[PDB]
């Protein structure tokens, strides 16, 4: 959660930075150091996450979320069975 807040704090700095970088070009002339350089950084982000785009891949992602949820659900069941064994042997 601390890492997610650091990442959202950073992402909000990126929104503010790119807004300033564009507006510098609109106002008079700007963005020369931020041209194909930043366009490669933003692409470097996008190529990694979200990887690709089609329906096949998001369907695969949602199936994996259901399996990760199933493993998490089974881990609640194992912990509850350990609790059922715990509750029988501490009376």
């Amino acid at each position: 959660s601390d890492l997610q807040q650091v990442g959202g704090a950073s992402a909000r700095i990126q929104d503010a930075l790119s807004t300033v970088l564009q507006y510098a070009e609109d106002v008079l002339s700007g963005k020369v150091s931020a041209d194909n350089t930043v366009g490669r950084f933003l692409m470097s982000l996008v190529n990694q996450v979200p990887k690709i785009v089609p329906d096949d891949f998001e369907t695969m992602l949602n199936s994996n979320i259901n399996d990760l949820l199933m493993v998490t659900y089974l881990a609640n069941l194992t912990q509850s069975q350990i609790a059922l064994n715990e509750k029988l042997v501490n009376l």
Binding site: N62, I65, N66, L69, T72
Partner: protein
Amino acid sequence: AMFEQMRANVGKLLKGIDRYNPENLATLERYVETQAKENAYDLEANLAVLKLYQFNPAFFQTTVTAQILLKALTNLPHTDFTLCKCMIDQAHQEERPIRQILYLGDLLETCHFQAFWQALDENMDLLEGITGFEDSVRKFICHVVGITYQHIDRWLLAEMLGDLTDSQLKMWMSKYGWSADESGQIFICSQEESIKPKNIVEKIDFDSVSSIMAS
């Protein structure tokens, strides 16, 4: 006219203790007459009269009961007809015209409209005196068509609604906005419109499930 004048004191009577007393029947039965006559409806009053008749068999009035039954058939697919089945024994159900009305009602409830039209006593006075019965039965048949047909045949719509000539058929077809269609059908609803499955198009679980699993 008469219905609202009674209603202002009948709605008190139905939420008092007065609804279990037979003395109130002479106003409640007239309220049932007025429901046939002026085409109004009251379910709590009709159910009270049927319960009074059920508890006290000697006050069973056939014409009043028949008017409640014929109004129950104007209200299909509501549960008024089921409530009438509950409150009346076979001995009171089987007399005239009650047994005919129940048979006609099962033909409506089981969607045998063609059999209902073919089994109806044409010259019965009681059927004429139920204000707006004819449009209401056809509205029920059109409602079953409008839910469950995308396109319907022109002869098939006339067959279901009781032998309507093409002048009369327009006064039904255009009453629901239904279009002419090619060779030589009537358009009722689109195929895309009459599907829309609520199931499977789901799995919004995660925001709710993650919240209750957060700690």
